[PDB]
């Protein structure tokens, strides 16, 4: 009966209201910025033991410099990421050189609002995480299914993201240490997760000014827990 | 049968020195026997710290320019932040091969300094071909100036020479001279000659005049 | 010259209640055989055949682009096409490549399907069709052809006149050609029947 | 009800009412101030983790802030990054920032006409120097646009407006510190009594007679507060 | 406008398509048509919904359509729409056969036209064919054949089957009458009257075709009056 | 042409098209599963007499390396097999290299996103198990439904009554269930069998490593049961 | 240009010469013609150098999405693949390219011809270029297989020394990139004349 | 249920309420209004000050669309803006073919069927604005035409649009403007705007004036400053 | 064009204080026939920007036709303003340019002259989109005749008035009357202040014929 493109009283795009609604029925995503670089973590939220824990994949290498966590329709990102990492090769090839982690993330952005009557026919139900290192240094990045997009230095995405925000707020300093950072989103996943968090429910990602964006290993989760 | 193409002669050339870098040209531009104006510098500033050199088809010349002008600007809105040097010469090279098939009858230098504060000199073929280079002379008079920047900068086929840093003050002698050898023998090279001083100061510039004939 | 490359020849000839229709089977590419058995013509019907000299690659294209467009006009209409018709929808098929042609000129033999009245014609390879009462011939060696038929043909010859007159126009015309020749088939089509030969032929 | 959700649908009143609606979307905005004198025109913006970006630079003698669909603000950014590149490329000059503003109007018009469409939900402030000197005009989802003196747009931007006609008098005559300081204390009329403006929440742009149009954020914002 | 559009290509909140069913209510309401396999062809019987007086007979059939050299189908539902999926498994066959040189096998024919039919469901917003149909054929890969097709694009082989009117009546008889690998032609076309005259007898109210195989070549015959005529005697006698 | 927006967002965040899409795999036929040592199987329910069994496969081979089973509705399925037969050839065209298990998934999962996401179209109404091996011979199970999200499972059922055979499997899938090539098989047959209520009304084929699929005769199946 | 490339034991060798010109005038002798498309493949370029350096660059990015989106490394036959795909779009149209793609998988060391016309070959050793003939004569006669790392660097250090010597088109200096399991190396930089005064 | 909601539904009745509606937002504007004269044409128009923030000159209502044609408003000034844009195009591209000016009741007749083609189809809706073309030359003589939201155009000797038409109107019709020059009638249109002004309800207006005749050698032009002030004072006086 | 047809030839620009003038001939050659015989080669763009054309005399009545329409479009607007003369040399070079590629030129070498903000504009613009200013221009057969004696006294002395810059422009034309086989002794000047533009003509220049006796 009514439009995609239809604006409510209040002046809001209807369409945009309930996509941004669906990223509650996402899993809980963490990323903290240090001057020592930036972390990334999330609740897989296994559904069964039958299931794979590897073959859920809610962070994602864009570059060696950058990487995305996700919340929200899963099956929407993966279009994002994919433009995203076009996106920072397109950039390399043409400037011999790396792309900003706000580049990459306005870039992304770009997308969203472009839908309406093959076309996209609904905006993306995705949020997204953007953590890497460029010459700014250490940057992380929240975008929403709007298109807006902000640098942040805590934020958290996801069902429990209000409560988890509020412990976010509380625990955040700027001269913070990298190895806190890692220790404060494990305890406040730990505490916002239905399930005990183990080595195999959870995802840990860093990006530092000495090295590549580097996903923790079984092993490596283990001794941080 | 129509040519879109011809021949408006000119003589660029890049000096990379420590902290310095140096793009000159003479200011002659020709068609056939005949000179156009004497008064047109093939020199183009891109940035604070960039400077374009541009010579061979004069109306490819100013597209071009006018080209790399507007995606200067569409970099700045979209990066925020000025294009580095080797980031300019990187994308000429793709804007030089999207002409691949009907190509800008250019030869380009690229002078200025790189992210360390150390003078850069960049290339190109009309294709864009192209490499980093401690100095190059590129367009009419390129086969005159190249063998004596070997000799004098590079200090090839000498023997029991020290090889001192060059400086400023040699290199704006040398430059001076190799135009003043090129316009006594290239019909193409002459009138004056326009050096553009590239440091961290900015950018400044120098008029030498050459033979009128 | 693009139709005497793989070379070839065909001939169609009338007779009373019957004709005929007749080929080389040379395949070739310029000097150089390549097989002695190659299909020229192409039964279109229970009583209705297509020749086809030329370009090999074009000769079997057309060949299979008539077959589908007639295969769907029989299942349409259901009924045998009348010979004018093959004509007329050959000369379509032809006359669509107006400006990048099939390179065959091909011939048509056959009768009625309903009076069995003899039929027999030719088209250029643009399509410019050609009803005679007599013969036509396509091919590399079609001035042989035409002296051949010109001296041998009579009118309201029975089905073994008919049967000599194609044959020795065919043995005696290809025989003067350096790229035609290598055997001939020979099909007479009757009211009741269809007989198909291969005639004893030189083989250089 | 059957009146209010296509943009092709006039009511009965001769109104259309997701026009209407695209005008509620800016006024949901943070507030933004621009005003202008002989010689300068200034934008100021109350900013929205890092506080949202709102204003733009458009060309070296335009820049714009937006209230609103962010999307849509960059959207028409762009659009008038383009008009600016395609003119200098074509005149070697800059476009006049009058014709730029036709040129925006055409096109946020074309949506309110079409179905299926919607108006641009952003409303934008633009400061701009040229041979006609400096400009404020200002743009709406309407597709209609104006030419201010001064102006203000955003969440209870009414009581900024009503401290600009108060002092516009004297816009003209003042210095450049004085016209920016004008800027801030109409913007801080929209605060809350307890709230004031910081350099964290505060984003100056400029553009004038001998000045490209520059953005002050942060640190850089400290100079034109420390007056006050 | 999307006032005025039905949305016919969409799901129910059960997962039905609505489109389909209804469409499949039409076919409920058509001519009985049915085929059965046997070991020496295969055979089309069907209702002719034409029994009018001052009707012409014009052509050789009127549900029975020869598709190729080797095949034949029949049709419940829309007439029109029967039309152009006809016209459509013609030029799908001569497709085939331009490409290959080779008679399109029988169940590659039924695919080609069931993803014509699954695309009206999925999307371009239009109404689905309202047409079944029953195709019958030979091919050198697994001789004699027996398709069904339906609305939604879905097919399946069968040793016998029934479509339109009564058609649940009729599978029911055909399950019970049925030899499996024990049928010949004759006891083929004897148990088709059988299931006919139930689920309807005249001569001129019944159309039936077989699909035979003569020295290595197909055979697609529609039976005379007089053969269908000989063919009610002999039952009633039953 | 048609440009409708078929799949939209509702309030809460919904996608109705989607789960509507996903009421159409609860209707279909049981599809189980199972990931072994050496050998993958797949096991469906059948609907009858007189119709050719040959024909009515809801089994189905992608590649020679891949096959897949489906649920829901069945003229989807045949236009989402047929479009991976496709780019099945088209990898082994541009890489040389047989498709992994993995890269066909994402394909088909993708495909099924975008008809999510695409003007004029509704989404593809079928779920599927893909099955087969990789190059260093690790077997591979993956699930796919109409939002197109794909994971991998150990042991897995899709379509009616796939909940209770789910938990069936978590119980009894174990080392010594998976331990031997028969008791694989045996153990998707018991999955089954809990849910038909038959034995003579199922199909099942295995795979082993680089050998094919082979489908097993009924005569087979009788001795299992 | 000379350019050769060699598989053995030990992985593969990749040299090349150093000069470009432009007709008869010498325009370069420090072109790079060894081109750096990941950390374990390398291209050469022959040929047009602006035709090379693009299409390679264009195969880099390739590789890199690639990687990104699979998990895995690009192997040596799909890599050359996706460059001769890329390339015969454009026959005909006058690009001129000779590349030797080299690297190490799943399959050992690898080592793929491609060129503009349309080839793409597997090979033991290639030589590409104007002074190819020269290179190839040389390398022929001293390749081994089981050739020792020291004695693999000195053969095609001479090969292209060799070529540098008869064809007018080939000089500079002499660039030798060795291709491990774990990636390749730089393995030296001869200036021509500084070869000259060690080979005699 | 409703037959309003579409340009491309006839009520019952045989109307077009959508084209009415439009209509309406004309009605709800302030007046412009247009006088033919002896020699030219002149245009004023009643601009309602919105806000004392705005310049002396924003949100014109009085355009040219060619050297020789000028254009006055009422309605959605958007939409306004977009036929004025039309119209230059349409002249622009007349000159292009033809070679000399467009003729005025061509340009009109050209315009309203654009206008006209707007209020066929569910697809776009019409035009909010009805408007004033103005011009003269020696050969043609002075000519003013009116279009509407429907696309309906004639020629008028006088003319009103938007919310006191019909009381601007019967001031346009005490005059003998056949007889009258521009000079004179510039006055007569600042008086008539300030008549039909409705000081009450709206509060500040600026008086808006153009005109083309053989004073401005048939050239669209703004009335220059010093002459509305005039206009503006005897409109004010005469008001007393 | 791809073939040119009716065509004129030179055109002569000079700067002064205060100004600029160009000059052409009246003449459009078909070939070696002198067929129209009083025809403008001079265009008035608006009130600081005049142009020259040599060339193919269709392919200037295009340039005339859209240039023309381009300034009518800009004064409706009324906004204060205007195209300088460098916007439109900047306009004219990137349309010859733009067709050029299109490997479809319009056959014409133009010169533009302007006065703008007390500045003396003049500009060249080729079919090839070959672009430049100089104190002095001359297209044609005049590069070679004009050019030579127009920079001779402009070396001397660089600021030229008014008058020194029209006498030094009839000794052109009369040397370009005597050797260019294209040209006609009937032309106009154009002169660009800060009073606008002003076309004069038809102007001819008296000759001297003595050397016949000689
Ligand atoms: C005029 C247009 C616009 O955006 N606004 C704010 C709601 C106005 O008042
Ligand atoms: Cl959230
Ligand atoms: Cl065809
Ligand atoms: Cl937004
Ligand atoms: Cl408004
Ligand atoms: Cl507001
Ligand atoms: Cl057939
Ligand atoms: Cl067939
Ligand atoms: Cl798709
Ligand atoms: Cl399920
Ligand atoms: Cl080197
Ligand atoms: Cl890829
Ligand atoms: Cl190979
Ligand atoms: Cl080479
Ligand atoms: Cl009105
Ligand atoms: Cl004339
Ligand atoms: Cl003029
Ligand atoms: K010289
Ligand atoms: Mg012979
Ligand atoms: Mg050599």
Known sequence: ?225 | ?213 | ?204 | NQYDNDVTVWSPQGRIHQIEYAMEAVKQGSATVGLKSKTHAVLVALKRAAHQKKILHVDNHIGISIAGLTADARLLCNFMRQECLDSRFVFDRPLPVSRLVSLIGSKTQIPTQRYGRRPYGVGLLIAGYDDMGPHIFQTCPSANYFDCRAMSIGARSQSARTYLERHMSEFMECNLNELVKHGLRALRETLPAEQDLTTKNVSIGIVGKDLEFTIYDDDDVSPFLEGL | ?238 | ?225 | ?200 | ?240 | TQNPMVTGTSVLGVKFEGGVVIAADMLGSYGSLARFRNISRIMRVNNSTMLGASGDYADFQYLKQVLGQMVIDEELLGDGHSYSPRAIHSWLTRAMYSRRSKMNPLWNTMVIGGYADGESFLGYVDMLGVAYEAPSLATGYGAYLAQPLLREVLEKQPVLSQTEARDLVERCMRVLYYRDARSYNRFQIATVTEKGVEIEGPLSTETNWDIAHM
């Not at chain 6, 098989?185 to 795979?207: D, F, P, T």
């Not at chain 8, 000159?95 to 206008?115: E, Q, T």
């Open chain 3, 1 to 204: 010259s693009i139709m005497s490359y793989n070379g070839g020849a065909v001939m169609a000839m009338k007779g009373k209640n019957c004709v005929a229709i007749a080929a080389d089977r040379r395949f070739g590419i310029q000097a150089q055989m390549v097989t002695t058995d190659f299909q020229k013509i192409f039964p279109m019907g229970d009583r209705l055949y297509i020749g086809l000299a030329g370009l090999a690659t074009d000769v079997q294209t057309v060949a299979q682009r008539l077959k589908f467009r007639l295969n769907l006009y029989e299942l349409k209409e259901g009924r045998q096409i009348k010979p004018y018709t093959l004509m007329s929808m050959v000369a379509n098929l032809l006359y669509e490549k107006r400006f990048g042609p099939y390179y065959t000129e091909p011939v048509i033999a056959g009768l009625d399907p309903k009076t069995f009245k003899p039929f027999i014609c030719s088209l250029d390879l643009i399509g410019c069709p050609m009803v005679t009462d007599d013969f036509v011939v396509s091919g590399t060696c079609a001035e042989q052809m035409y002296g051949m038929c010109e001296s041998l043909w009579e009118p309201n010859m029975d089905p073994d006149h008919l049967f000599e007159t194609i044959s020795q126009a065919m043995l005696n015309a290809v025989d003067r050609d350096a790229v035609s020749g290598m055997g001939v088939i020979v099909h007479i089509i009757e009211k009741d029947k269809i007989t198909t030969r291969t005639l004893k032929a030189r083989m250089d």
């Open chain 1, 1 to 225: 009966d009514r439009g995609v493109n239809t604006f409510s009283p209040e002046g809001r795009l209807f369409q945009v209201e309930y996509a941004i609604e669906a990223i509650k029925l996402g899993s809980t995503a963490i990323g903290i910025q240090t001057s020592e670089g930036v972390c990334l973590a999330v609740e897989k939220r296994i559904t069964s033991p039958l299931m794979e824990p590897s073959s859920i994949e809610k962070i994602v290498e864009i570059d060696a410099h950058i990487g995305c966590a996700m919340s929200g329709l899963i099956a929407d990102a993966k279009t994002l990421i994919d433009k995203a990492r076009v996106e920072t090769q397109n950039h390399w090839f043409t400037y011999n050189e790396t792309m900003t982690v706000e580049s990459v993330t306005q870039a992304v952005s770009n997308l969203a609002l472009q839908f309406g009557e093959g076309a996209m026919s609904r905006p993306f139900g995705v949020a997204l995480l953007f953590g890497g290192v460029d010459e700014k240094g250490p940057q992380l990045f929240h975008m929403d299914p709007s298109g807006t997009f902000v640098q942040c230095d805590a934020r958290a995405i996801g069902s429990a993201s209000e409560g988890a925000q509020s412990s976010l707020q509380e625990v955040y300093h700027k001269s913070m240490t990298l190895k806190e950072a890692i220790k404060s989103s494990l305890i406040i996943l730990k505490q916002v997760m239905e399930e005990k968090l183990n080595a195999t429910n959870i995802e840990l990602a860093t990006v530092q000014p000495g090295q590549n964006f580097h996903m923790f290993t079984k092993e490596e989760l283990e001794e941080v827990i």
């Open chain 2, 1 to 213: 049968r129509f040519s879109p193409y011809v021949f408006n002669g000119g003589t660029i050339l890049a000096i990379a020195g420590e902290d310095f870098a140096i793009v000159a040209s003479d200011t002659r531009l020709s068609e056939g026997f005949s000179i156009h104006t004497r008064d047109s510098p093939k020199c183009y500033k891109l940035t604070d710290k960039t400077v374009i050199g541009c010579s061979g088809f004069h109306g490819d010349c100013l597209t071009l320019t006018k080209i790399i002008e507007a995606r200067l600007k569409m970099y700045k809105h979209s990066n925020n932040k000025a294009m580095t040097t080797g980031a300019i010469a990187a994308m000429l090279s793709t804007i030089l091969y999207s002409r691949r098939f009907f190509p800008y009858y250019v030869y380009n230098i690229i002078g200025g300094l790189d992210e360390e504060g150390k003078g850069a000199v960049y290339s190109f073929d009309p294709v864009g071909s192209y490499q980093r280079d401690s100095f190059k002379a590129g367009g009419s008079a390129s086969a005159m100036l190249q063998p004596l920047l070997d000799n004098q900068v590079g200090f090839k086929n000498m023997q029991n020479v020290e090889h001192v840093p060059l400086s400023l003050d040699r290199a704006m002698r040398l430059v001076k001279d190799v135009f003043i050898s090129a316009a006594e023998r290239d019909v193409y090279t002459g009138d004056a000659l326009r050096i553009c001083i590239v440091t961290k100061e900015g950018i400044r510039e120098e008029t030498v005049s050459l033979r009128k004939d």
């Open chain 7, 1 to 200: 240009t000379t350019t050769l490339a060699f598989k053995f034991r030990h992985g593969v060798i990749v040299a090349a010469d150093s000069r470009a010109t432009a007709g008869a005038y010498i325009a370069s002798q420090t072109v790079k013609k060894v081109i750096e498309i990941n950390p374990y493949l390398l291209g050469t370029m022959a040929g047009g150098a602006a035709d090379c350096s693009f299409w390679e660059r264009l195969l880099a990015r390739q590789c890199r999405i690639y990687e990104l989106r699979n998990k895995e490394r690009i192997s040596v036959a799909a890599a050359s693949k996706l460059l001769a795909n890329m390339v015969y779009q454009y026959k005909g149209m006058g690009l001129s390219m000779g590349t030797m793609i080299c690297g190490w998988d799943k399959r050992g060391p690898g080592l793929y011809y491609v060129d503009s016309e349309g080839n793409r070959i597997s090979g033991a050793t290639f030589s590409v270029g104007s002074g190819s003939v020269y290179a190839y004569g040389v390398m022929d006669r001293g390749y081994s297989y089981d050739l020792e790392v020291e004695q693999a660097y000195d053969l095609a250090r001479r090969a292209i020394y060799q070529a540098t010597y008869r064809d007018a088109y080939s000089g500079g200096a002499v660039n030798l990139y060795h291709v491990r399991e774990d990636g390749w190396i730089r393995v030296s930089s001869d200036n021509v004349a500084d070869l000259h005064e060690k080979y005699s």
């Open chain 5, 1 to 238: 406008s999307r006032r005025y559009d039905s949305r016919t290509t969409i799901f129910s909140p059960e997962g039905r398509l609505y489109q389909v069913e209804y469409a499949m209510e039409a076919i409920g309401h058509a001519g009985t048509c049915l085929g059965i396999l046997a070991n020496d062809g295969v055979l089309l019987a069907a209702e002719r919904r034409n029994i009018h007086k001052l009707l012409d007979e014009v052509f050789f059939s009127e549900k029975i359509y020869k598709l190729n050299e080797d095949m034949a189908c029949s049709v419940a539902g829309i007439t029109s729409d029967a039309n152009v999926l006809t016209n459509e498994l013609r030029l799908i066959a001569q497709r085939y056969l331009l490409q290959y040189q080779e008679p399109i096998p029988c169940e590659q024919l039924v695919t080609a036209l069931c993803d014509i039919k699954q695309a009206y469901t999925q999307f371009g917003g239009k109404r689905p064919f309202g047409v079944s149909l029953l195709y019958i054929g030979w091919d050198k890969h697994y001789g004699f054949q027996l398709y069904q097709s339906d609305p939604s694009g879905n097919y399946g082989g069968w040793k016998a089957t029934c479509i339109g009117n009564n058609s649940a009546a009729a599978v029911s008889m055909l399950k019970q009458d049925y030899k499996e690998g024990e049928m010949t032609l004759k006891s083929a076309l004897a148990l088709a009257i059988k299931v006919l005259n139930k689920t309807m007898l005249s001569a001129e109210k019944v159309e039936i075709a077989t699909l035979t195989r003569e020295n290595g070549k197909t055979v697609i015959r529609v039976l005379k009056q007089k053969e269908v005529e000989q063919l009610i005697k002999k039952h009633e006698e039953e």
């Open chain 8, 1 to 240: 249920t409703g037959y309003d909601l579409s340009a491309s539904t006839f009520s019952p009745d045989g109307r077009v309420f959508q084209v009415e509606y439009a209509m309406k937002a004309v009605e709800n504007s302030s007046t412009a209004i247009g006088i033919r004269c002896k020699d030219g044409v002149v245009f004023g128009v009643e601009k309602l000050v919105l806000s004392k923030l705005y310049e002396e000159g924003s949100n014109k209502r009085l355009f040219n669309v060619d050297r020789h044609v000028g254009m006055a408003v009422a309605g959605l000034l958007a939409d306004a803006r977009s036929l004025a844009d039309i119209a230059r195009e349409e002249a622009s591209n007349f000159r292009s073919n033809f070679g000399y000016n467009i003729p005025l009741k061509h340009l009109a007749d050209r315009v309203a069927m654009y206008v006209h083609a707007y209020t066929l189809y569910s697809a776009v809706r019409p035009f909010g604005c009805s408007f004033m073309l103005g011009s003269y030359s020696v050969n043609d003589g002075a000519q003013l035409y009116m279009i509407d939201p429907s696309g309906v155009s004639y020629g008028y000797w006088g003319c009103a649009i938007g919310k006191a038409r019909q009381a601007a109107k019967t001031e346009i019709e005490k005059l003998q403007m056949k007889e009258m020059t521009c000079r004179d009638i510039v006055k007569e249109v600042a008086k008539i705007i300030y008549i039909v002004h409705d000081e009450v309800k709206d509060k500040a207006f600026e008086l808006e004036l153009s005109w083309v005749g053989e004073l401005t050698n048939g050239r669209h032009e703004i009335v220059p400053k010093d002459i509305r002030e005039e206009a503006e004072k005897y409109a004010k006086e005469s008001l007393k």
């Open chain 6, 1 to 225: 042409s048609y440009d409708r927006a078929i799949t939209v967002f509702s309030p809460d965040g919904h996608l109705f098209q989607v789960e509507y899409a996903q009421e159409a795999v609860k209707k279909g036929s049981t599809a189980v599963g199972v990931r072994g040592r050496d050998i993958v199987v797949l096991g469906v329910e059948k609907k009858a007499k007189l119709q050719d069994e040959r024909t009515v496969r809801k089994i189905c081979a992608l590649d020679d390396n891949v096959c897949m089973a489906f649920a829901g509705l069945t003229a989807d399925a045949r236009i989402v097999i047929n479009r991976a037969r496709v780019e099945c050839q088209s990898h082994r065209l541009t890489v040389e290299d047989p498709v992994t298990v993995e890269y066909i998934t994402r394909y088909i999962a993708s495909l099924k996103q975008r008809y999510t996401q695409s003007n004029g179209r509704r989404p593809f109404g079928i779920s599927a198990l893909i099955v087969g091996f990789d190059f260093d011979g690790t077997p591979r199970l993956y699930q796919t439904d109409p939002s197109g999200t794909y994971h991998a499972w150990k042991a897995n059922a899709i379509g009616r009554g796939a909940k209770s055979v789910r938990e069936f499997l978590e119980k009894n899938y174990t080392d010594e269930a998976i331990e031997t090539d028969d008791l694989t098989i045996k153990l998707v047959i018991k999955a089954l069998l809990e849910v038909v209520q038959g034995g003579k009304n199922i199909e099942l084929a295995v795979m082993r490593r680089d050998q094919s699929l082979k489908i097993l005769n009924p005569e087979e199946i009788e001795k299992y049961v």
